[PDB]
Amino acid sequence: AKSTENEIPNLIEKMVAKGLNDLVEQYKFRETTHSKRELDSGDDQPQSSEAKRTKFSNPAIPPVIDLEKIKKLMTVTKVSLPEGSFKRVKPQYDEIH
Amino acid sequence: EHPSIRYVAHPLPEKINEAKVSIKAYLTQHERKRLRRNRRKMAREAREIKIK
């Protein structure tokens, strides 16, 4: 319960994320169950990599976060300088500032 | 008198520490398919968005 309280939003999305994480460990027969999720978390613990993979799983499981972000991202481009420091993106054009 | 013949004992039953093996809950074929369908679908959607 304590564990859930601190890091875990404990929704459907969170559960999904957790599942994904466990799969990425390796787990075959649907790894391990969740009474309150706590057990699952405990099981994961040995694998040790928890909250990063929800900061990916919400970007995929829908892209609503992505949409929000859009409403950007800069690479080490040609002639950065590196005094120049801006790069947006939008689908009709790769708008660089 | 030193060991009494009156009383009936009910001593402490020592509970052995059982190792909680969290059960491999399995999935139905259908369930598995659904899982695969949905994750893949989500990925596809992401790709589309992150390309449209």
Next chain:
Amino acid sequence: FFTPATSELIFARRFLINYSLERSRKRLQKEMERHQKFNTRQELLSRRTELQRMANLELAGSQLVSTKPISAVSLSTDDMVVATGSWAGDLQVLNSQTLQPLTQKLDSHVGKIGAIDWHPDSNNQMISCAEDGLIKNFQYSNEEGGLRLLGDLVGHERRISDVKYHPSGKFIGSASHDMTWRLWDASTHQELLLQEGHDKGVFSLSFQCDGSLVCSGGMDSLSMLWDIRSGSKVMTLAGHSKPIYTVAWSPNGYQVATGGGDGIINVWDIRKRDEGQLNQILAHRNIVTQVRFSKEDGGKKLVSCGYDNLINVYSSDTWLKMGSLAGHTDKIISLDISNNSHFLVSGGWDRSIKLWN
């Protein structure tokens, strides 16, 4: 810790103490006498001979019995007939040496028969338990027919494993898949004890033949030696790993011998206050079902049968596989030894009783 009382128990307990004590003293005296008059050679030779005899036992007669398998095989005190509980709830009896039935009694128990014991007073009023969840005394007649039941004794809630008769004849102990083991009043057919001393069921009992100490073998692997008089214990669970499906004493109160699911028969409780095992014995490849001894009447010889398709025999000083007994085709769930002689009667999943001569 948590100590109430009852009057019947008190009345009996004193009697038990007296009886146990006198008998115990007698036994001790006998033992003393034995050491005093023994010699290295002749006794040793005799022992060797006995061992040889045990080894060169072979399967004499395998008489089938019942639809389902034969839970219990118990030879009479007289040693003439054997009683064979099968899982159906029927306890046929057979003239041991020929091994032919007397009667059938399906309408006795409905559940799986547990153990059958014979009454130690030659006057044959055998007891038998079941998963049925009640024990039944049976006044046995050779002539009249077969068996007539005397009294039923509802004490346990869950299915029973094993009853024994306390060597007096005035008490019948019964242990069950419920947490307790319960000692009964032979005459009035009413309870006294209930030792809630195991986290799972008491799978087996065994009285010490002097009448002082009862080992309760639990499904927990906690073999508890209860002074019945005191309600106080001198235990080691540090024997077994799996469940203790049987326990039985060398009649010479000297030893307890617990047979296991782990298969290792552990023979302990000794003059030794440290309580260390003179040995653990590797009994059967799969599990051990029954353990017996036979120094009532003759010499002390461990004998056990298992879910391995083998009975075997062990020297009560060495503890060694003195000889395997191929004979059963399938599992062997129970066994008894002829008090006087070399003549084992054992039964099981082959669904036959079998003699060894």
Next chain:
Amino acid sequence: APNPKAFPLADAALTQQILDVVQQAANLRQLKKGANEATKTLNRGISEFIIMAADCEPIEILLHLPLLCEDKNVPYVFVPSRVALGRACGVSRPVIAASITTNDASAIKTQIYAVKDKIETLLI
């Protein structure tokens, strides 16, 4: 808590093992789920070993199967969880009885045999 008449109940590890075996059999078509199918298997002789659900309520609807097994000398357990058993079988719906059937040429013969042995050990 589980039923007394549901006996022999497995232990945890043992239960897990049995479920794994069931799953394997399901994949290899060497299993049959369902009280009635278990019964059929028993009748045939094809049942290697029977798995029942302790948490069948009303337990009575199983408690012929054990008898049958006894009368056919097929080992048997109850596991605790009918949901779990169902899942193993490959059925979302909760299941009470299954039968791992016989077939000499199974990949999983050895595994099955192990489980059978374990079951037998439990019985007494």
